JSON list of C-alpha atoms in Angstrom, two decimals:
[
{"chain": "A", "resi": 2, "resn": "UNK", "atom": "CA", "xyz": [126.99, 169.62, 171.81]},
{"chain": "A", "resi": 3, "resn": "UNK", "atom": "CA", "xyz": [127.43, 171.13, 175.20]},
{"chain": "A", "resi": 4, "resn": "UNK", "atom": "CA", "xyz": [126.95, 167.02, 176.82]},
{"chain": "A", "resi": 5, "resn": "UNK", "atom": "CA", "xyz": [127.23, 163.52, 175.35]},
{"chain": "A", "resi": 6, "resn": "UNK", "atom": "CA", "xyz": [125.82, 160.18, 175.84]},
{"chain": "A", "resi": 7, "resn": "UNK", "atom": "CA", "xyz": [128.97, 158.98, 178.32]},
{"chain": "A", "resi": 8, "resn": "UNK", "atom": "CA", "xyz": [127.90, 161.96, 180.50]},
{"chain": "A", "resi": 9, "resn": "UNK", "atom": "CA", "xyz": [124.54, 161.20, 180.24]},
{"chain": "A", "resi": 10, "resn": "UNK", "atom": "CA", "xyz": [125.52, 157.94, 181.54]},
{"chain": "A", "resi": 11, "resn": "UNK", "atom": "CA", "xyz": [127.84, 159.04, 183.95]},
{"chain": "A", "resi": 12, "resn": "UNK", "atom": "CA", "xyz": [124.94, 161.79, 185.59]},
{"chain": "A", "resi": 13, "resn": "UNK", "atom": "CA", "xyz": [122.05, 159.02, 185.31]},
{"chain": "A", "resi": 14, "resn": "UNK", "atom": "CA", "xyz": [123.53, 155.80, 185.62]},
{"chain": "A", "resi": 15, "resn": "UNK", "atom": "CA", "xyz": [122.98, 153.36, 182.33]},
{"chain": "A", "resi": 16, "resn": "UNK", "atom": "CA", "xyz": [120.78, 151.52, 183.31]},
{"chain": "A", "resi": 17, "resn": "UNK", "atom": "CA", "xyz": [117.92, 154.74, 183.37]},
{"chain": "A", "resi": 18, "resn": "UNK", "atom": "CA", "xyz": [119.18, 156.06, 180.58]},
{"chain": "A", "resi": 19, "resn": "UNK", "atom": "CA", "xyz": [118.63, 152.45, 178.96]},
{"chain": "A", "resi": 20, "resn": "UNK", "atom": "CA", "xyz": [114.98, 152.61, 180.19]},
{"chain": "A", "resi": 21, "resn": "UNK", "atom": "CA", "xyz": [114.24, 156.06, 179.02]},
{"chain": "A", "resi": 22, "resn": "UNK", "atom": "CA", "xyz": [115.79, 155.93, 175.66]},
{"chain": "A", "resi": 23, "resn": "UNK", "atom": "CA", "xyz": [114.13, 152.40, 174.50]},
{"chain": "A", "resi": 24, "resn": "UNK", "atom": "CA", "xyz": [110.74, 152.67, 173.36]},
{"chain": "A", "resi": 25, "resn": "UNK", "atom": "CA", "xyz": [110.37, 149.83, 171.12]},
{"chain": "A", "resi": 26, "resn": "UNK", "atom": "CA", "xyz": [111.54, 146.45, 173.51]},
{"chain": "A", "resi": 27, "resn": "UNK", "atom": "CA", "xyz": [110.18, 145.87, 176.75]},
{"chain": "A", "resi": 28, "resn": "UNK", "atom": "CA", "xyz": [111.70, 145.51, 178.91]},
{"chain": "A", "resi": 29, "resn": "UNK", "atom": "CA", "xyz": [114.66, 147.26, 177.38]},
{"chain": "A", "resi": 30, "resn": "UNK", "atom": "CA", "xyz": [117.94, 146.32, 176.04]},
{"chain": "A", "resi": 31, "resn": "UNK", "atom": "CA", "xyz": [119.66, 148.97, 174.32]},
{"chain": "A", "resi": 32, "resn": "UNK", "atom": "CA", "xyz": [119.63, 152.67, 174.26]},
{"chain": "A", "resi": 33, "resn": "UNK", "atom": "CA", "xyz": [118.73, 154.50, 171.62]},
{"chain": "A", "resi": 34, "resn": "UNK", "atom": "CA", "xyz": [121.32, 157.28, 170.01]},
{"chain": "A", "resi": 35, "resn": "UNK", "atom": "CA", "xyz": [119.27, 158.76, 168.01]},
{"chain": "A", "resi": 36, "resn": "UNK", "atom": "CA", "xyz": [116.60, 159.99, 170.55]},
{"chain": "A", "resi": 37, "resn": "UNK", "atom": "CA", "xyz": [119.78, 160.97, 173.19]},
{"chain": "A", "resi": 38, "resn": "UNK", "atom": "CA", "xyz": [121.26, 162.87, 170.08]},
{"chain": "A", "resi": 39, "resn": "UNK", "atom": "CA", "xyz": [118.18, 164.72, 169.83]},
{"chain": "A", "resi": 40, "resn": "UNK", "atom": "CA", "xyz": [117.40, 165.28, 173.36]},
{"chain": "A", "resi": 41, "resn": "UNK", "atom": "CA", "xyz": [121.18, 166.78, 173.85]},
{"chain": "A", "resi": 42, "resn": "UNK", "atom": "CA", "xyz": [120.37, 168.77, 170.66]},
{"chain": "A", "resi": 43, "resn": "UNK", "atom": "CA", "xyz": [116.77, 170.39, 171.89]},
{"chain": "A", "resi": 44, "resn": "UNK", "atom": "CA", "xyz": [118.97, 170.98, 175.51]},
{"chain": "A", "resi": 45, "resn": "UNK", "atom": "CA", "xyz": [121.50, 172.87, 173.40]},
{"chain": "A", "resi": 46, "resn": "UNK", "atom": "CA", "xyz": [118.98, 174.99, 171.05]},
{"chain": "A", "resi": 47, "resn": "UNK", "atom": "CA", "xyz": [116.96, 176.07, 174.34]},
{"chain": "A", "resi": 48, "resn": "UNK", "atom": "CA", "xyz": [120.16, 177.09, 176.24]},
{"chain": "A", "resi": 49, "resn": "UNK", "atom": "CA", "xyz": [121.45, 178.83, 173.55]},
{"chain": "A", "resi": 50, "resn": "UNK", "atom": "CA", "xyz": [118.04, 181.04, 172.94]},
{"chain": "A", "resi": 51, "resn": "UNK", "atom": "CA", "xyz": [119.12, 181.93, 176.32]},
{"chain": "A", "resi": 52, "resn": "UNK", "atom": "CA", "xyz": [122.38, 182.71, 175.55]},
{"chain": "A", "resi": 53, "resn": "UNK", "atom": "CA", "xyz": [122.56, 184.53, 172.51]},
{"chain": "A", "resi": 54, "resn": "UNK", "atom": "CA", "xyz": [121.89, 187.71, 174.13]},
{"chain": "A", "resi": 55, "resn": "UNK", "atom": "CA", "xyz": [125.34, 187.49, 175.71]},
{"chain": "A", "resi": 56, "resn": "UNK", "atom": "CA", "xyz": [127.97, 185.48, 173.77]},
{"chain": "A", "resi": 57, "resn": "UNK", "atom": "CA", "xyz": [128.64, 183.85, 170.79]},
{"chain": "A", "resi": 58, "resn": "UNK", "atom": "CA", "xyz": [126.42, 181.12, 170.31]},
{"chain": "A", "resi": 59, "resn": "UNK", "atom": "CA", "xyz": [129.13, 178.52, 168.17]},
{"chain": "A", "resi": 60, "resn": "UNK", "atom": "CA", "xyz": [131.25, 178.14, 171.36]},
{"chain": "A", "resi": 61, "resn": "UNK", "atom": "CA", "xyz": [134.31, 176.44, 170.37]},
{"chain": "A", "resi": 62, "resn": "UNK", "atom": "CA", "xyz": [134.38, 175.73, 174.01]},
{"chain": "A", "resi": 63, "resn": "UNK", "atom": "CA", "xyz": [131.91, 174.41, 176.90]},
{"chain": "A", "resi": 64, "resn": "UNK", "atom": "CA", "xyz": [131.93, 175.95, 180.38]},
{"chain": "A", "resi": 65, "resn": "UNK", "atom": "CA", "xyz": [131.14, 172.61, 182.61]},
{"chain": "A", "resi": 66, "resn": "UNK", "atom": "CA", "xyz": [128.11, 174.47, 184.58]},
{"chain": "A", "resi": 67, "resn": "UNK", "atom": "CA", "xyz": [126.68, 174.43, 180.94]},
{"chain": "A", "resi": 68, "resn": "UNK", "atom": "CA", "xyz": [127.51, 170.58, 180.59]},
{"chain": "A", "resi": 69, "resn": "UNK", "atom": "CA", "xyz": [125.42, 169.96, 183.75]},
{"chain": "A", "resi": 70, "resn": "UNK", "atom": "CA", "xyz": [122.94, 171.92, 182.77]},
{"chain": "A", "resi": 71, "resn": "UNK", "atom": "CA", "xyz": [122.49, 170.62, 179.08]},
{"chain": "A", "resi": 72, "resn": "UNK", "atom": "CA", "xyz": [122.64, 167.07, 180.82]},
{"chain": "A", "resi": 73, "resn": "UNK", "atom": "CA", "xyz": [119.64, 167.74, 183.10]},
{"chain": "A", "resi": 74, "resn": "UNK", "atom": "CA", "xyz": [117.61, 169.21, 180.43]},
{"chain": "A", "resi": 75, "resn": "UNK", "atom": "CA", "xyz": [118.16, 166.61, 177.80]},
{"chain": "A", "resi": 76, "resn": "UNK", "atom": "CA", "xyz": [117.08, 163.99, 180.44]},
{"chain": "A", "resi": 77, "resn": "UNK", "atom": "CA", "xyz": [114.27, 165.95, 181.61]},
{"chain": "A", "resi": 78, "resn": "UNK", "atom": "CA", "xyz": [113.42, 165.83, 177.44]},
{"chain": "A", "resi": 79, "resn": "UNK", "atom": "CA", "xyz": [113.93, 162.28, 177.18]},
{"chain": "A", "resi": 80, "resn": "UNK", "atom": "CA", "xyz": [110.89, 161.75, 179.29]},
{"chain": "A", "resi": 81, "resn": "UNK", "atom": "CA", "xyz": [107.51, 161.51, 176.80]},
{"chain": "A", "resi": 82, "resn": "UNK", "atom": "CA", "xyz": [105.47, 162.37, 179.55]},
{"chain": "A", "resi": 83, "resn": "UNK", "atom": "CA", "xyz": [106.35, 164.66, 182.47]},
{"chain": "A", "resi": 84, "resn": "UNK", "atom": "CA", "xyz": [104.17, 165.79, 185.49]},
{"chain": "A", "resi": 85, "resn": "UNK", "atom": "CA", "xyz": [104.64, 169.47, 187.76]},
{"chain": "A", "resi": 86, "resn": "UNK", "atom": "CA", "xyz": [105.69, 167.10, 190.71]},
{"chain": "A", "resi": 87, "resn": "UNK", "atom": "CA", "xyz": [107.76, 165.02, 189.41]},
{"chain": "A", "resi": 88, "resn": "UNK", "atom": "CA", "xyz": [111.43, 165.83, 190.66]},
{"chain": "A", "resi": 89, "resn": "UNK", "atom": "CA", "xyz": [113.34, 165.42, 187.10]},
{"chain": "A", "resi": 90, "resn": "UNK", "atom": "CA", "xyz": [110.61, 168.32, 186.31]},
{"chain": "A", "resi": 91, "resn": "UNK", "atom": "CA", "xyz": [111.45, 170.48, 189.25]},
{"chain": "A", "resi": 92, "resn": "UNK", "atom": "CA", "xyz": [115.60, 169.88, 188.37]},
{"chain": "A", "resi": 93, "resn": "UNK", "atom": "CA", "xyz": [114.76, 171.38, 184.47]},
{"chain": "A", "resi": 94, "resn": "UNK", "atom": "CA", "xyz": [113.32, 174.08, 186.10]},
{"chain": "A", "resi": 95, "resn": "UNK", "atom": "CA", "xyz": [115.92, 174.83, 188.50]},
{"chain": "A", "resi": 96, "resn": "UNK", "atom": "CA", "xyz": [118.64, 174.54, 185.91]},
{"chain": "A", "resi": 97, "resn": "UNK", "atom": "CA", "xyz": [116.07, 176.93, 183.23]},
{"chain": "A", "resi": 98, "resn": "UNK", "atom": "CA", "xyz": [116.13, 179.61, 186.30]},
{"chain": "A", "resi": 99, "resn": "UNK", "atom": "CA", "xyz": [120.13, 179.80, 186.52]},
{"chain": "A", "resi": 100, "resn": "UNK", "atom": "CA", "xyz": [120.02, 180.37, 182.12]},
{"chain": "A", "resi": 101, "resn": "UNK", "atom": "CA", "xyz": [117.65, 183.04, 183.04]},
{"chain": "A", "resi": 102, "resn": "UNK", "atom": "CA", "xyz": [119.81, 184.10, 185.93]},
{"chain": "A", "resi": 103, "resn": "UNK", "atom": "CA", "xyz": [122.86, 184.17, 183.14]},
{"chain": "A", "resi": 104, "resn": "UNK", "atom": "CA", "xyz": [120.69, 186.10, 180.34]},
{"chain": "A", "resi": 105, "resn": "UNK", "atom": "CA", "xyz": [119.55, 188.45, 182.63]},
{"chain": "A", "resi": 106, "resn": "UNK", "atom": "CA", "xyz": [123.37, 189.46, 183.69]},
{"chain": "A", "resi": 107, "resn": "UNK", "atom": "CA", "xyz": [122.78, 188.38, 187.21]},
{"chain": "A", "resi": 108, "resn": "UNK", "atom": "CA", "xyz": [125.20, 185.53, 186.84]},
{"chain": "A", "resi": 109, "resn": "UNK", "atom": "CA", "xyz": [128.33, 184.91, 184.79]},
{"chain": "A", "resi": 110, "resn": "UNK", "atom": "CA", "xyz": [129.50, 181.91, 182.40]},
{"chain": "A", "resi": 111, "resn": "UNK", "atom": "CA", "xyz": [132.70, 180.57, 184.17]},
{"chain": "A", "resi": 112, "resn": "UNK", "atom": "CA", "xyz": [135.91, 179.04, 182.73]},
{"chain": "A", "resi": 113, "resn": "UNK", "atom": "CA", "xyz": [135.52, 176.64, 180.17]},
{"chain": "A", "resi": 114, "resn": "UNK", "atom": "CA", "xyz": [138.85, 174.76, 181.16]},
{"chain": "A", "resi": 115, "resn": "UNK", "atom": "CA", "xyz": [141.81, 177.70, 181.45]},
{"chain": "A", "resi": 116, "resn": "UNK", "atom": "CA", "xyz": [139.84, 180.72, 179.40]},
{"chain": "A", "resi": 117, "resn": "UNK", "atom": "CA", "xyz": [137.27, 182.85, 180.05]},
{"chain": "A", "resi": 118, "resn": "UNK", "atom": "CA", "xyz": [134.32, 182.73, 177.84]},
{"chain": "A", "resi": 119, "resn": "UNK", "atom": "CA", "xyz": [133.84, 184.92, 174.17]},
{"chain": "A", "resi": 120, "resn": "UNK", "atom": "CA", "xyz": [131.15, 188.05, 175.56]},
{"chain": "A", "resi": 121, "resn": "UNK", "atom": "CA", "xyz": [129.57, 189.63, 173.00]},
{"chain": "A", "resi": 122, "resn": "UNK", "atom": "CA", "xyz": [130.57, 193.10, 171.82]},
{"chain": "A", "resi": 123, "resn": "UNK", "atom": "CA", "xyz": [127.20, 194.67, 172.69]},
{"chain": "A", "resi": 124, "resn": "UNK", "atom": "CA", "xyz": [127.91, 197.08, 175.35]},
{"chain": "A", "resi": 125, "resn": "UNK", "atom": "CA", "xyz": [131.07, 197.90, 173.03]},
{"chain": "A", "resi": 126, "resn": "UNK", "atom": "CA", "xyz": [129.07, 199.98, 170.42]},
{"chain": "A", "resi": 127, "resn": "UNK", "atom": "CA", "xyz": [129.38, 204.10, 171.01]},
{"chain": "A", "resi": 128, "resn": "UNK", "atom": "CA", "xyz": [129.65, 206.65, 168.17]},
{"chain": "A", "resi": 129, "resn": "UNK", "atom": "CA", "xyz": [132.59, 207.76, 166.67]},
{"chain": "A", "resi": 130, "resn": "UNK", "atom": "CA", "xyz": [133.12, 210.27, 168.99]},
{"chain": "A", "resi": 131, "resn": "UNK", "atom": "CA", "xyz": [134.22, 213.75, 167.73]},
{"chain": "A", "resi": 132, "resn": "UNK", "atom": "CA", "xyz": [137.17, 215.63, 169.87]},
{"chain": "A", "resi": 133, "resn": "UNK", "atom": "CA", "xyz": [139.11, 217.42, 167.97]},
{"chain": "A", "resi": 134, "resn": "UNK", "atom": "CA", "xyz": [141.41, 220.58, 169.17]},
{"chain": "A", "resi": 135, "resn": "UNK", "atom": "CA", "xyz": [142.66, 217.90, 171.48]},
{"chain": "A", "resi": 136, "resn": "UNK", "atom": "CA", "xyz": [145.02, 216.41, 169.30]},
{"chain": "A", "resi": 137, "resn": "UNK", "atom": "CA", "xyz": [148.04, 218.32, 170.52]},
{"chain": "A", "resi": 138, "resn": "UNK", "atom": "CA", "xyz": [148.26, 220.54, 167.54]},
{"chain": "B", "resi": 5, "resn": "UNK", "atom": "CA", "xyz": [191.27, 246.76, 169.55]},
{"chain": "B", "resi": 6, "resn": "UNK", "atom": "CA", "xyz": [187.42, 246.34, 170.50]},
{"chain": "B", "resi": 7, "resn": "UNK", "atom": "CA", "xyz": [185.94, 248.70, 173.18]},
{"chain": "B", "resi": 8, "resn": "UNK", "atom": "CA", "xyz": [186.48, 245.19, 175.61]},
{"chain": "B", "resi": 9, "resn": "UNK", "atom": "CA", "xyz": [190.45, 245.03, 175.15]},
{"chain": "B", "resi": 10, "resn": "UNK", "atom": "CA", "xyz": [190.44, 241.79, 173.18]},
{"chain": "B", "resi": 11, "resn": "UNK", "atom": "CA", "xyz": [193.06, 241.42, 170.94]},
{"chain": "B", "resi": 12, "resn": "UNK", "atom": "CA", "xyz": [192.01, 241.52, 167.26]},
{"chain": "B", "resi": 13, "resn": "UNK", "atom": "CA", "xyz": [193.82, 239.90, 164.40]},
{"chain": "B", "resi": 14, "resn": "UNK", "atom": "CA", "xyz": [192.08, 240.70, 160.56]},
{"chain": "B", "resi": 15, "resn": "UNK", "atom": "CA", "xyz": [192.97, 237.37, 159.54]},
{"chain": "B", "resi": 16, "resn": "UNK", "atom": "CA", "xyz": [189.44, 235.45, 161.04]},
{"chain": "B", "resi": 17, "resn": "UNK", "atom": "CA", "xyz": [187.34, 238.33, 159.38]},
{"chain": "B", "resi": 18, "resn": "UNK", "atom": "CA", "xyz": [187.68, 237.07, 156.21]},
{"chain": "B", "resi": 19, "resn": "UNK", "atom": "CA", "xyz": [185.40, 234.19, 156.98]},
{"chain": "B", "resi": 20, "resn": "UNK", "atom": "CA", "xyz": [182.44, 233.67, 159.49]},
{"chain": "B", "resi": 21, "resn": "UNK", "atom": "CA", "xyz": [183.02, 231.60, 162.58]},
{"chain": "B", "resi": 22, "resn": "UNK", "atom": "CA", "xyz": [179.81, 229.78, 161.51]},
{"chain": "B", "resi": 23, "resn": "UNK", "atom": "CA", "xyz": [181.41, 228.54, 158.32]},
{"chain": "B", "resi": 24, "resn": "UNK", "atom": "CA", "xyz": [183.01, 226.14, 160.07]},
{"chain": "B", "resi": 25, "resn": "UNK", "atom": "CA", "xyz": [179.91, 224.36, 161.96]},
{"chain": "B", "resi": 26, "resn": "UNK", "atom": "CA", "xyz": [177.97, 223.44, 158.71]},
{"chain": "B", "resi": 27, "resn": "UNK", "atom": "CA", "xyz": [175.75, 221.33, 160.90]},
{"chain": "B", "resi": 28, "resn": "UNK", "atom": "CA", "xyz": [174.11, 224.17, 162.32]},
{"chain": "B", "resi": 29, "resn": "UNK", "atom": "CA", "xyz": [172.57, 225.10, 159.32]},
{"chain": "B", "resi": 30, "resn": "UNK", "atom": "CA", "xyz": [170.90, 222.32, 158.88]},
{"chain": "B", "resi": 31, "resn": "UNK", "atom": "CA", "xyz": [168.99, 221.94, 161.90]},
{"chain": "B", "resi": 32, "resn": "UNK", "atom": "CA", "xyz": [165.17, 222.28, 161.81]},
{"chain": "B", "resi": 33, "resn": "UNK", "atom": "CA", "xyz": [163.57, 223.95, 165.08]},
{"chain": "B", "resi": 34, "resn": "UNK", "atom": "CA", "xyz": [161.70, 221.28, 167.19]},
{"chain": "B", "resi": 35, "resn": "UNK", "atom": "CA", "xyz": [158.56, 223.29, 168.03]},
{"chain": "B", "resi": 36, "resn": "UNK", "atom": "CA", "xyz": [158.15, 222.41, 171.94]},
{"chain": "B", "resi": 37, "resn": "UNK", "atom": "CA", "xyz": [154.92, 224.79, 172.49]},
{"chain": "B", "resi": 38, "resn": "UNK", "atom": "CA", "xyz": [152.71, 221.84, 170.87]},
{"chain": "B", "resi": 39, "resn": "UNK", "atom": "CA", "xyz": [151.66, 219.73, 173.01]},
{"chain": "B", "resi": 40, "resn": "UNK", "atom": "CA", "xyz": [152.77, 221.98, 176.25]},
{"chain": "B", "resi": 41, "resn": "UNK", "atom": "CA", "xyz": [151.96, 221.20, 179.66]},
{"chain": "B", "resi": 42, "resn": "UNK", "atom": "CA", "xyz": [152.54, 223.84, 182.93]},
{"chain": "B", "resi": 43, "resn": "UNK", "atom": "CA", "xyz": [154.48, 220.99, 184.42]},
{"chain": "B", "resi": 44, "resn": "UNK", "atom": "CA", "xyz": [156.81, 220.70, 181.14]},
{"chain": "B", "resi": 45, "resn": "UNK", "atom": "CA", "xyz": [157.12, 224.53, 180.63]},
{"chain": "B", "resi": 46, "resn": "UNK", "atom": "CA", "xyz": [158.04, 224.77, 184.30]},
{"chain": "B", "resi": 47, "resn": "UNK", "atom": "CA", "xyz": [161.02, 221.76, 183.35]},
{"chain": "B", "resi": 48, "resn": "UNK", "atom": "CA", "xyz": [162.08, 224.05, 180.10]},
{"chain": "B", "resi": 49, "resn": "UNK", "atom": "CA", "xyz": [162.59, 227.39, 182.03]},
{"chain": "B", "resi": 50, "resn": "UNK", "atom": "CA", "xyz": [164.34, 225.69, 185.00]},
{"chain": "B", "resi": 51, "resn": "UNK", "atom": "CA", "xyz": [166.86, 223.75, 182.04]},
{"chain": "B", "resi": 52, "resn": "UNK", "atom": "CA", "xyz": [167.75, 226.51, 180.36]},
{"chain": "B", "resi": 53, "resn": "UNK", "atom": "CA", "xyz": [168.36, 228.50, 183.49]},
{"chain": "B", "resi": 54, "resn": "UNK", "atom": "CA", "xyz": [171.41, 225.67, 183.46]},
{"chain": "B", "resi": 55, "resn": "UNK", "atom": "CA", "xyz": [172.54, 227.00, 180.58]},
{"chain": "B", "resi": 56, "resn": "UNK", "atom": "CA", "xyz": [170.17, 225.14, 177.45]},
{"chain": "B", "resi": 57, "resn": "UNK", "atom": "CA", "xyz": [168.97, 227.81, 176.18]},
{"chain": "B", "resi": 58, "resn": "UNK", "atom": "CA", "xyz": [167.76, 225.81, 172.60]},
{"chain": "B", "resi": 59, "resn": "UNK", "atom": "CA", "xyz": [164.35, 224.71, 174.08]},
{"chain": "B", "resi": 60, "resn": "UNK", "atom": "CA", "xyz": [163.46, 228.00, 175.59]},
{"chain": "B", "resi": 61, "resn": "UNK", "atom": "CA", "xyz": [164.17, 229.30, 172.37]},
{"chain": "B", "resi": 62, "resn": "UNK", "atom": "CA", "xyz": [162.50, 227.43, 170.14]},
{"chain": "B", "resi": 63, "resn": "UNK", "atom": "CA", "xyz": [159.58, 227.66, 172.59]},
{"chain": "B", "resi": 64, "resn": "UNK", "atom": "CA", "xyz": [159.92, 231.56, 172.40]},
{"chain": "B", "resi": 65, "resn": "UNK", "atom": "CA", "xyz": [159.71, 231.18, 168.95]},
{"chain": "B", "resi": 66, "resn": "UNK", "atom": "CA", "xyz": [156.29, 229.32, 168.53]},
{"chain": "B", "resi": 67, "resn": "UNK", "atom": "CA", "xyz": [154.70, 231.23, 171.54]},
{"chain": "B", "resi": 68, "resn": "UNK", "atom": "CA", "xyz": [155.27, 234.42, 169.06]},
{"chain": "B", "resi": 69, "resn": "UNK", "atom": "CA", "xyz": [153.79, 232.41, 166.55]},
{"chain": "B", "resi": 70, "resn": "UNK", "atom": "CA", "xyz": [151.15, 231.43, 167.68]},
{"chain": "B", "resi": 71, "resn": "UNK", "atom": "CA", "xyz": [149.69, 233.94, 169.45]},
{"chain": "B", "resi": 72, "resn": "UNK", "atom": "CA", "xyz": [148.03, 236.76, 167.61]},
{"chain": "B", "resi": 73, "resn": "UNK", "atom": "CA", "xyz": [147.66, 239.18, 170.45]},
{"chain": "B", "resi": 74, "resn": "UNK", "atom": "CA", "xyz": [151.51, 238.74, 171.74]},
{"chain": "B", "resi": 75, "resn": "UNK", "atom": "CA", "xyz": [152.19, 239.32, 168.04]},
{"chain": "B", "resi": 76, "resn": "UNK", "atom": "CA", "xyz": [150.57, 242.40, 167.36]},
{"chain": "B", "resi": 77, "resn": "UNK", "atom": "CA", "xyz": [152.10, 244.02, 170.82]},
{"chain": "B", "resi": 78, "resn": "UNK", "atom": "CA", "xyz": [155.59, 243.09, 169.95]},
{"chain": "B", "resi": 79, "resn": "UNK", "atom": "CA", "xyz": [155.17, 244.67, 166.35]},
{"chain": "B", "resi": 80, "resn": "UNK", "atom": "CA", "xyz": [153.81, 247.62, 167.84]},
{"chain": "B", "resi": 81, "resn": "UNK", "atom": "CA", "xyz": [156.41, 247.92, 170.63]},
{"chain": "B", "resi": 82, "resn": "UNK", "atom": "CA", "xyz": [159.26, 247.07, 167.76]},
{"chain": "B", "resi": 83, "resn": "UNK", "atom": "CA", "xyz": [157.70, 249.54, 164.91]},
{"chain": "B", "resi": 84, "resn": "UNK", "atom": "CA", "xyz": [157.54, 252.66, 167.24]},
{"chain": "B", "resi": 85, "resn": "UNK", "atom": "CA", "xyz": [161.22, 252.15, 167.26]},
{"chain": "B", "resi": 86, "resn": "UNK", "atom": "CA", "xyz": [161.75, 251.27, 163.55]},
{"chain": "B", "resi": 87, "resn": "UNK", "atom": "CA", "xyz": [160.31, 254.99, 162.88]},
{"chain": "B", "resi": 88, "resn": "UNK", "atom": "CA", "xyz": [162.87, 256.95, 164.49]},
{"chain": "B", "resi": 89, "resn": "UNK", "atom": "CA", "xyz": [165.23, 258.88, 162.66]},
{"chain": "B", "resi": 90, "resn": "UNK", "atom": "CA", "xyz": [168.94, 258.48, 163.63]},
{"chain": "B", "resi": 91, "resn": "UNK", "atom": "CA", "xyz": [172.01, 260.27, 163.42]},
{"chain": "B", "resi": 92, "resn": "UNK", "atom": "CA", "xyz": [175.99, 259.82, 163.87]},
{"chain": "B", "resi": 93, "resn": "UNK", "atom": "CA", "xyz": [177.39, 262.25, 166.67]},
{"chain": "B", "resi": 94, "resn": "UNK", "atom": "CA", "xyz": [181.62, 263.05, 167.61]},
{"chain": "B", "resi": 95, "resn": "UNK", "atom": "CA", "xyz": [182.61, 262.91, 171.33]},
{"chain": "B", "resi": 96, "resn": "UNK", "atom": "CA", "xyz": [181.38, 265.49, 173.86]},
{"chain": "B", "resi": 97, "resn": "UNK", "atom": "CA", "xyz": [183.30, 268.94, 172.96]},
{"chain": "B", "resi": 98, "resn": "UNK", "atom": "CA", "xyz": [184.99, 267.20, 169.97]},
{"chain": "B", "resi": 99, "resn": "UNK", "atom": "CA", "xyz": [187.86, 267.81, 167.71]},
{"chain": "B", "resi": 100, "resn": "UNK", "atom": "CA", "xyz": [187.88, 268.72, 163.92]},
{"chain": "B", "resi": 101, "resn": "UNK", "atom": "CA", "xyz": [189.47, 265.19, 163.08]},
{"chain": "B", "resi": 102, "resn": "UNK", "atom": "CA", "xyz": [186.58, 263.62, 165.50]},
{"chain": "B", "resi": 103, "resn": "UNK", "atom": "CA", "xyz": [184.21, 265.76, 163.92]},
{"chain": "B", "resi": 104, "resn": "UNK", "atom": "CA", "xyz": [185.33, 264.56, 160.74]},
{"chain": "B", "resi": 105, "resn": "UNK", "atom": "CA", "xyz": [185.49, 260.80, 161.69]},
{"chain": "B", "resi": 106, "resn": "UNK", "atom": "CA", "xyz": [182.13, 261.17, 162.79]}
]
């Protein structure tokens, strides 16, 4: 759950939030949690295929670039139908080049709030490493 | 009196002036040479220049040790000497009693 409905909300405004998430009363009324939960969940699975690679992916914390980033692809999910030109398309797409950007180790996940983030120990691994007659016998 | 002057009493022979420093015995050498560095050799030869001559010789010790080739040399060198034969001699143009006495 890298974003939440209130910042959702607090990206989009309510009121298109209200008209995205509200297929069944027209003109709508309420928003829908269920179909925000799932578009925030679909946001979080796709970052975090782009992500494993790197850190672990059950962060116990969010870095807030990731919170904008989950935002604007769960809204650009929340859309049932989606065109190349339409701007909320070419946002996703800008957002889905900085993940690759991260995967690819050109950028780096920043501060979550005071700590750095949990890297992987992939470049870690080398053999156990044999050196003996340097032991200061 | 010994050959340097020094008054001599026969009381202190009966025991050894070690006797009395039971600590000594007890020590167990500290084996510098392992570990040894030319920077930390250079710092054991200047100390016991000043007089602590304990490292040095604990380091003499495991440099004889551990080194076959040193070994073998300074059996040689002491073994040629071990082999010679030996014998008691009086003073130049001596006497019958410092014939005898010898």
């Amino acid at each position: 759950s890298y974003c939440t409905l209130a910042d959702l909300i607090e990206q989009y405004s309510e009121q298109k939030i209200r008209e995205v998430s509200d297929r069944v009363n027209k003109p709508a009324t309420t928003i829908d949690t269920v179909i925000v939960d799932r578009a925030i969940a679909d946001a979080d699975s796709e970052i975090d295929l782009h992500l494993h690679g790197r850190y672990q992916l059950p962060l116990a914390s969010v870095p807030t670039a990731l919170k904008r980033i989950a935002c604007g692809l769960a809204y650009a999910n929340l859309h049932i139908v989606l065109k190349e030109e339409n701007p909320v398309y070419k946002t996703a797409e800008h957002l889905r080049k900085l993940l690759s950007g991260i995967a690819n180790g050109k950028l780096s996940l920043a501060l979550d709030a005071d700590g750095k983030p949990a890297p992987v120990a992939n470049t870690v691994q080398i053999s156990e490493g044999r050196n003996d007659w340097g032991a200061d016998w | 009196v010994d050959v340097y002057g020094n008054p001599i009493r026969t009381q202190q022979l009966r025991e050894p002036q070690t006797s009395r420093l039971a600590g000594l015995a007890k020590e167990f050498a500290q084996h510098p040479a392992k570990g040894l560095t030319p920077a930390k050799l250079a710092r054991i030869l200047v100390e016991a220049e000043q007089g602590n001559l304990q490292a040095q010789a604990e380091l003499f010790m495991d440099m004889e040790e551990r080194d076959a080739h040193l070994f073998a040399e300074m059996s040689k060198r002491k073994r040629a000497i071990l082999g010679l034969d030996w014998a008691v001699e009086p003073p130049r143009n001596a006497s019958a009693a410092e014939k005898a006495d010898a």
